[PDB]
C-alpha cells in the first residue's frame, strides 16, 4: 500500500483504490496503474520534474529504502496479475530490487522529488508508475 500527496491530490495505483477514491476522482488511467483522487487536506510531497535514472525506493516487506538505478518510463509486457491480465503496461520504469504484491504503492524518489510509485515485481525486479510526465499535479 501507499499513496502521493502533492497539493490537493491523492496518487494511488488504480487496482488498489478505494470507494472514496471512485467517489472524488480527478483522473484514471488502467493501462498506467494510475488513479488521482481529490483531497480536503494539502499533501507535503513534491513531483520530480527531471530525467533521473537512479533513486532510492521504500520496500514495505523489507521496512527498507533501498537506492536503485531504474529505466526510462516505457511500454512494457507485465504477466498476468490478480488485478490485471498480462497486457503491456505504459509509463513503466524496471530496476533490480526486492519487491512482493503488497509493495505496491512505495514512493521511488531522486534529488528533485517523488518520481513514481511500486506497480510491478517479480525475481528480483521491481517495476515503478511514472508520475513525471503529469505536470497538472503542481496546480488547481
Ligand atoms: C500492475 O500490476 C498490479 C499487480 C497487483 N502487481 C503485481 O502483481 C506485483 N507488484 N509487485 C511489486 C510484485 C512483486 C512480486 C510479484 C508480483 C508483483
Ligand atoms: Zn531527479
Known sequence: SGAIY???????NRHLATHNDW?????????????????????????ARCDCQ?????CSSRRKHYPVSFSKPSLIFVEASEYYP???????????????????????????????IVSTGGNGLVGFADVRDLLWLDEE
Open 86 to 116: 498480462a497486457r503491456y503496461q505504459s509509463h513503466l520504469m524496471l530496476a533490480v530490487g526486492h519487491s512482493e504484491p503488497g509493495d505496491c504503492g512505495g514512493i521511488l524518489r531522486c534529488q528533485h522529488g517523488v518520481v513514481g
Open 6 to 12: 502533492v497539493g490537493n491530490y491523492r496518487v494511488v
Open 54 to 58: 537512479t533513486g532510492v525506493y521504500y
Open 23 to 47: 467517489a472524488n476522482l480527478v483522473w484514471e488511467d488502467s493501462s498506467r496503474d494510475l488513479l488521482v483522487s481529490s483531497t480536503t487536506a494539502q499533501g507535503c510531497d513534491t513531483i
